[PDB]
């Protein structure tokens, strides 16, 4: 384009391994932070337990229900429950899905995330559907029932920020490394004998030129090249994770700019 550059090294459903070129450190860091915490996601926020004769406690189950990865594609055309003019929750802000499991066979009856059934009216929006990357097609193992044990409850999922709870976290671990040769000297290496033989050599060393001992220290160099690997949980596709991260940061900058526009009022 004209500014910062991207070079996608590896690309898949779960991971994006790319190189960020022509960017300030603070922007890369802030991007990472937003991607980690400040991206909207749908997750179980309320649990209404009717009958619970299982081993696990009520809120014990409710907790791991909260962590279940739900579809958050069209989450942007969903609304915060705190914003909606409804009582408690409705179809414009929340997605309600029920869970009804009971011990049938003599063997242990497993309760997965696939047993969750969307009830509320989605009215077209791709949302609420529990992510199943499982090979067998079961998904997250929620609970285990005996012979006559029953679990009947109702989940109300709401739009939330991962800054409020880690259950709304759209990504997992984001790999981040700049200057694989310590040419900026931001790190004084610890050693016992040799500094290079003890410390492992990064993969990202393949994409940069090694320093010459005949060359003096470059004191006027900054941080331009960054090596990132963003991993998604499933709720939001990787490309959409980084893109909505960017748009979120952009939007929250634009909110400050707008605030400055507003403070000029008498």
């Amino acid at each position: 384009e004209e500014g910062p550059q991207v070079k996608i090294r590896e690309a898949s459903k779960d991971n994006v391994d790319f190189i960020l070129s022509n960017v300030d450190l603070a922007m890369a860091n802030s991007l990472r932070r937003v991607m980690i915490a400040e991206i909207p996601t749908l997750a179980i926020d309320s649990v209404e337990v009717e009958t619970n004769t299982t081993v696990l406690a009520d809120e014990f189950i409710a907790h791991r229900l909260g962590l279940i990865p739900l579809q958050s594609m069209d989450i942007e055309q969903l609304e915060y429950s705190r914003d909606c003019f409804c009582e408690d929750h409705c179809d414009k802000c929340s997605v309600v899905l029920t869970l009804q499991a009971f011990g049938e066979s003599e063997s242990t009856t497993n309760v997965y995330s696939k047993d969750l059934v969307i009830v509320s009216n989605l009215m077209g929006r791709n949302i609420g559907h529990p992510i199943i990357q499982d090979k067998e097609g079961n998904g997250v193992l929620i609970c285990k029932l005996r012979k006559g044990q029953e679990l009947k409850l109702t989940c109300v999922a709401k739009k939330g920020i991962a800054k409020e709870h880690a259950k709304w976290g759209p990504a997992a671990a984001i790999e981040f490394e700049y200057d694989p040769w310590n040419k900026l000297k931001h790190t004084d290496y610890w050693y016992e004998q040799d500094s290079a033989k003890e410390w492992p050599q990064s993969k990202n060393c393949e994409y940069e030129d090694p320093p010459n001992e005949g060359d003096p220290f470059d004191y006027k160099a900054q941080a331009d090249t960054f090596y990132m690997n963003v991993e998604s949980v499933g709720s939001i596709p990787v490309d959409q994770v980084v893109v909505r991260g960017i748009d979120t940061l952009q939007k929250k900058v634009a909110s400050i700019l707008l605030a400055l526009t507003q403070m000029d009022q008498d």
Partner: protein, 44 residues
Amino acid sequence: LKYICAECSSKLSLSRTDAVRCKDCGHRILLKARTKRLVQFEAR
């Protein structure tokens, strides 16, 4: 109100002036049933 036995699956409804024991069992350990008024849980 109603109560359920401990070491067997039953559903006694014996209120006051009854208490122990159970119906077709023989043991006096009696637990109380779950409330009908449901309770919500913040999945956090």
